[PDB]
Amino acid sequence: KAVIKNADMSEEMQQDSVECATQALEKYNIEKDIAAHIKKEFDKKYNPTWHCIVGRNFGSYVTHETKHFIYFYLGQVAILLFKSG
């Protein structure tokens, strides 16, 4: 049950975020590894440089390229994926 809280990317790039995060959740138990999976995939499919944060409790402030930002809920975790550089 994905829930988009704040998206800036295209409906297509947005679908790839959810899907990609889904596979990582089906595979990894540790947030850091889930974050890595998603980051590495986006660096590949959409070129560097991306950054990913996964967790249940945190606040952040970042600088990103417009149309390249997404914050959403998947499972009981929240994912912040964005490109800068």
């Binding site: 704040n6 800036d8 967790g55 249940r56 409790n57 945190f58 606040g59 952040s60 402030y61 970042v62 600088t63 990103h64 390229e65 417009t66 930002f69 914050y71 809920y73 009981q76 929240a78 912040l80 964005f82 800068s84």
Partner: peptide
């Protein structure tokens, strides 16, 4: 090229 500064708070 066209940057934005965004903050997010997570408490689920």
């Amino acid at each position: 090229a066209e940057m934005k500064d965004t903050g997010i708070q997570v408490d689920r």
